[PDB]
Amino acid sequence: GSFKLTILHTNDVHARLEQTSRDSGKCSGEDCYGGVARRATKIRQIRASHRNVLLLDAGDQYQGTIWFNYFKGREVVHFMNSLRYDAMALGNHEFDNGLNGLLDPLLKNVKFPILSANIRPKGPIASKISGYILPYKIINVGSEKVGIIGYTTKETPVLSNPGPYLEFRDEVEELQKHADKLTTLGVNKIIALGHSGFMEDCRIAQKVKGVDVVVGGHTNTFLYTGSPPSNEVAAGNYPFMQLSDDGRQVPVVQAYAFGKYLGYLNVIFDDKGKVIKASGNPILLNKSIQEDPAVKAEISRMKVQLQNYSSQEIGRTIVYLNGTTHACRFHECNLGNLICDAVVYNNLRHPDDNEWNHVSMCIVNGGGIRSPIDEQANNGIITLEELTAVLPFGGTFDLLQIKGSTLRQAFEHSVHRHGQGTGELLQVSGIKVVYDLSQKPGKRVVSLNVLCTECRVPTYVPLEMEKTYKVLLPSFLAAGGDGYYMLKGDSSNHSSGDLDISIVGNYIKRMGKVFPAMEGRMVFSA
Amino acid sequence: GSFKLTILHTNDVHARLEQTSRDSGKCSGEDCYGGVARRATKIRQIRASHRNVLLLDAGDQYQGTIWFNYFKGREVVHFMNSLRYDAMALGNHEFDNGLNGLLDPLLKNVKFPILSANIRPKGPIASKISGYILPYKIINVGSEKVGIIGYTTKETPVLSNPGPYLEFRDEVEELQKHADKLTTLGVNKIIALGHSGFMEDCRIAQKVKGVDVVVGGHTNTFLYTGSPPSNEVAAGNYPFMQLSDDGRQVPVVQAYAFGKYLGYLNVIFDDKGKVIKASGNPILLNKSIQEDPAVKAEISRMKVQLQNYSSQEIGRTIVYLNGTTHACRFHECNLGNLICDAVVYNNLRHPDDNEWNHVSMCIVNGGGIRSPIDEQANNGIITLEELTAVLPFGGTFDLLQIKGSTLRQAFEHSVHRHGQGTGELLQVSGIKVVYDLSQKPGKRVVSLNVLCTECRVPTYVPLEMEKTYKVLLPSFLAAGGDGYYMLKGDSSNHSSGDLDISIVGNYIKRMGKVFPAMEGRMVFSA
Numbered sequence A, B: 001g002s003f004k005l006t007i008l009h010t011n012d013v014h015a016r017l018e019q020t021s022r023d024s025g026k027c028s029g030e031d032c033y034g035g036v037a038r039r040a041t042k043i044r045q046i047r048a049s050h051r052n053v054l055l056l057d058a059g060d061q062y063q064g065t066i067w068f069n070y071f072k073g074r075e076v077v078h079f080m081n082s083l084r085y086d087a088m089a090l091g092n093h094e095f096d097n098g099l100n101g102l103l104d105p106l107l108k109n110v111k112f113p114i115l116s117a118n119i120r121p122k123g124p125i126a127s128k129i130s131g132y133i134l135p136y137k138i139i140n141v142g143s144e145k146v147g148i149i150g151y152t153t154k155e156t157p158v159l160s161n162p163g164p165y166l167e168f169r170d171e172v173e174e175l176q177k178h179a180d181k182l183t184t185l186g187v188n189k190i191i192a193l194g195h196s197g198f199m200e201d202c203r204i205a206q207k208v209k210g211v212d213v214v215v216g217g218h219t220n221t222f223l224y225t226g227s228p229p230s231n232e233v234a235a236g237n238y239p240f241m242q243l244s245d246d247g248r249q250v251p252v253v254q255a256y257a258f259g260k261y262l263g264y265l266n267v268i269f270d271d272k273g274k275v276i277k278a279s280g281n282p283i284l285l286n287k288s289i290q291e292d293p294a295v296k297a298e299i300s301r302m303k304v305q306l307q308n309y310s311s312q313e314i315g316r317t318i319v320y321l322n323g324t325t326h327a328c329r330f331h332e333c334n335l336g337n338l339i340c341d342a343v344v345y346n347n348l349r350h351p352d353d354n355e356w357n358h359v360s361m362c363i364v365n366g367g368g369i370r371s372p373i374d375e376q377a378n379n380g381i382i383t384l385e386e387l388t389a390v391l392p393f394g395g396t397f398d399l400l401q402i403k404g405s406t407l408r409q410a411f412e413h414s415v416h417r418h419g420q421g422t423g424e425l426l427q428v429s430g431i432k433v434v435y436d437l438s439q440k441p442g443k444r445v446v447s448l449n450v451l452c453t454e455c456r457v458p459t460y461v462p463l464e465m466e467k468t469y470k471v472l473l474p475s476f477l478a479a480g481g482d483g484y485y486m487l488k489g490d491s492s493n494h495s496s497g498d499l500d501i502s503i504v505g506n507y508i509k510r511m512g513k514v515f516p517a518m519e520g521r522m523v524f525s526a
């Protein structure tokens, strides 16, 4: 009397609706990957040949491409319902459009439960939202009952826009309460589904008695047993077998991100609800898997509707936005000033008491600004086509925790080859830097002043070498681009943020007219 | 035979719907003036005792109080119709909310002609806007026909937002074409009604053959015969008799502004349309004239709605907006930075020739900022009530043409008593000032750099002593307040702008969240 459960799972799909390139960009080439149409095919084939199948999502369907900026989650609702997901745990980006952008459209229109056990409401609007979200759900699978408990990263307040009246509690403390409740209700098979990262997933697997399987996300973790099928590098076996405090192996799974893989885990339980076997591997959604015709047709219709989003006037510039190489790579460029003002504006989060905001600074290397925008071309009208010329790579702006000394080392790197025309020079917001190019490379920073966060009135204070700062920066720099090895982020100090063109476009739309100046954010001693 | 025409006229009423103080601020109830209810009474009394009466408005009903900010011209439609104006010429401020804000509600709902002969539509606007704005109107008055030709200042593209498809032509040339047309049509009594200022009114009186009377506005010009009744000083007789090029004495009239006076001119024409006599005086609308109870009840009903509106959330601050005297009168205050950023944003106009905008700088004396706004008080919610606490006097931000030498003299005055806590210290936008307070008073300005206008990318350049600049500044300073005699403007170098709390409120409404920093716009060197 044993029970075989097949778990299919996705996480951090991040608005990759259409099939993508191998790097989950726009597929311009022959061999494409992922997309909902391909996922729908593999899910259907598995459901037709496997007896007991659960389809779970571990959060962060929101945010990532213009698909989310235009359809605002209606594309998530539509295809998750069409694919018949059995449950979804909330990710940090599901709060990107606030609690109203979560209620409408997601909470109001999904045909499956939305789970998050470690969220406590404190205001009337937040408690309205939480009425829609359950801490767990019992799902009938064949003759058996499977309990699924949700959880969401405690960093959602700093990463996204849940508002001040939504509290994110400790995952292990909240999950144990609902595991114990499920046990008393007679449910002996329990899956923890959530968006807090691989390390937190392993802690849950270790500490929460009664949890049999952990399905996570947030860290884009790729696990594989054997030689992986594409260019992602495995951080461990799939599933990762975490030894519990109870002396059992608890399978922990994630399936990378961007819909490139479909998680596929076969779990066998004994008749007491103990996992006796757990095996499988994430399925690479490459050209060998046919795109489902009906989903592909709906995508092809929606691509036509996206043309409105791409050619609509967002706003206007009344000044030349000087994104030429000669400007952005050699001195202060007013376009760089606008981009980093837009980035700071997008990361204004509910202040937690001792700060007017958790971050006040942004940087972007001149090499990341790929084109000017001419205000004389078409009455300064800005659409996504002009913004794509500036920011063509579909990257994000991320949050990096960084010591003052490290930050100052980045600004030394910013002018260590100044004059050679490469893309290092940092355009900034919330920073005043003074350079002396006469000096030897590595000693050209005269002074750095930054906008305080621990203040009621933002004001410029000297950078402190031993203090820890938050800084916004392009994903390219956070991966070490352009020799910025000291800006490289990891799971301990780095968080993936919002799409770059979406950040800038929203800002331009808010301003209506833009006229950024060269204002002395960087000063050359000459 | 002779023909007696009584002309009643208003100009630059500027949203003074309720009765006002002597200086056209908010009334205390002690001794009030103007308001539409009082004007309605005097108009009724004159119509009951005079045979042939015309009630004309020479423009600038729009803009000036919270009445215009909320009702957006619906209050002008309502009471100008109820008072049965016979004609109105468009003023520069009728374009403050663009053509859409002029068409709706004013052009489509007034029950009297709207006149402006020197406005030429282009392309899409043409069709109906040609039908809504007429160059002239023939009005039957008793047994006679009186032609009224409208005109509007050519400076409207720079003062307001008429948009790119409206051309403003020369007043004398266009008025002459239509005077000739009216003359050929058999109309021998012709009134020029318009909004271009006293100097242009007299030029029209001198040069436009066939014009018998000029009724003007824009400059708030006060004319009176004999000793004036209040604190306004007469710039000339009422009417002002301009000798025409062909030896005709042409009466020119204006009636100050803000509805304090009702213009009142008795004109005697002979049977061939020549003015034989022009006599009268503007009627001071003081408490000896009763507020019409029915109009007052309508005002009171509408004011109840305005009181609700003034307590509504416009936006939020996530920082303390430090409008305390200790900040704004001694050093850089982030609230002053926001105010003048809002002022510059409000004055972005269609750039002609060589400039990204016609003005780039704003100043506001610390003494004009009367309160902070606490971000901890009510979740940082900003309403019109909070803005009224900061800017309580109902003033405007005006445009002043000023040479660099005078501006530098103004910034010396800004710190000549620094430390005494008086209100001179200038908060700025688009200006970088460096002070040295150790120097003798009058020599404390180290440097002044300003945002260039004649540039594609705004950038800071040294102030040139002999160059003429445009600067935005409060109505209080343009009148010489706080010892700034050198900022005092006249019609040759000064233009009255929009209500201060509307400028700030609209910017906050657009920004959504505000977070101004102290960023070194002014620096006190050791």
Ligand SMILES: *[C@@H]1O[C@H](CO)[C@@H](O[C@@H]2O[C@H](CO)[C@@H](O[C@@H]3O[C@H](CO)[C@@H](O)[C@H](O)[C@@H]3O)[C@H](O)[C@H]2NC(C)=O)[C@H](O)[C@H]1NC(C)=O
Pocket (backbone or CB within 6 Å): A320, A322, A324, A326, A327, B456, B457
């Ligand atoms: C966008 O930024 C670029 C780079 O800063 C601007 O180009 C540069 O413009 C400056 C000032 O016009 C030039 O300095 C001067 O050039 C003129 C004629 O080229 C020369 O006669 C002067 O002696 C002085 O050196 C600079 O050479 C020029 N550099 C390049 C590579 O073009 C550009 O003007 C900016 N775009 C806009 C629309 O403002």
Ligand SMILES: *[C@@H]1O[C@H](CO)[C@@H](O[C@@H]2O[C@H](CO)[C@@H](O[C@@H]3O[C@H](CO)[C@@H](O)[C@H](O)[C@@H]3O)[C@H](O)[C@H]2NC(C)=O)[C@H](O)[C@H]1NC(C)=O
Pocket (backbone or CB within 6 Å): A456, A457, B320, B322, B324, B326, B327
């Ligand atoms: C709004 O602006 C005012 C004016 O600057 C601020 O008041 C001033 O705040 C400073 C703190 O930055 C006070 O200074 C410090 O003084 C104490 C002695 O009391 C000493 O520890 C140091 O010498 C330090 O410089 C200053 O005394 C204070 N002035 C007054 C008249 O209160 C005010 O804090 C600002 N409001 C907010 C909410 O930020």
Ligand SMILES: *[C@@H]1O[C@H](CO[C@@H]2O[C@@H](C)[C@@H](O)[C@@H](O)[C@@H]2O)[C@@H](O)[C@H](O)[C@H]1NC(C)=O
Pocket (backbone or CB within 6 Å): B305, B308, B309, B312
């Ligand atoms: C007061 O206003 C509340 C919110 O309304 C908004 O602002 C007012 C000023 C109007 O412009 C309204 O159209 C806006 O939606 C109302 O909920 C409330 O009913 C108002 N109070 C009364 C007595 O009507």
Ligand SMILES: *[C@@H]1O[C@H](CO)[C@@H](O)[C@H](O)[C@H]1NC(C)=O
Pocket (backbone or CB within 6 Å): A308, A309, A312
């Ligand atoms: C096109 O985009 C604009 C801007 O988001 C939106 O307001 C409008 O409704 C869209 N039009 C259609 C037909 O979807």
Ligand SMILES: [Ca+2]
Pocket (backbone or CB within 6 Å): A188, A189, A190, A210, A211, A212, A272, A273, A274, A275
């Ligand atoms: Ca179990």
Ligand SMILES: [Ca+2]
Pocket (backbone or CB within 6 Å): B188, B189, B190, B210, B211, B212, B272, B273, B274, B275
């Ligand atoms: Ca005549």
Ligand SMILES: [Zn+2]
Pocket (backbone or CB within 6 Å): A012, A014, A060, A091, A093, A218, A219, A496
């Ligand atoms: Zn994610």
Ligand SMILES: [Zn+2]
Pocket (backbone or CB within 6 Å): A012, A060, A091, A092, A093, A195, A217, A218, A219
């Ligand atoms: Zn995440």
Ligand SMILES: [Zn+2]
Pocket (backbone or CB within 6 Å): B012, B014, B060, B093, B218, B219, B496
């Ligand atoms: Zn006026």
Ligand SMILES: [Zn+2]
Pocket (backbone or CB within 6 Å): B060, B091, B092, B093, B195, B217, B218, B219
């Ligand atoms: Zn005017």
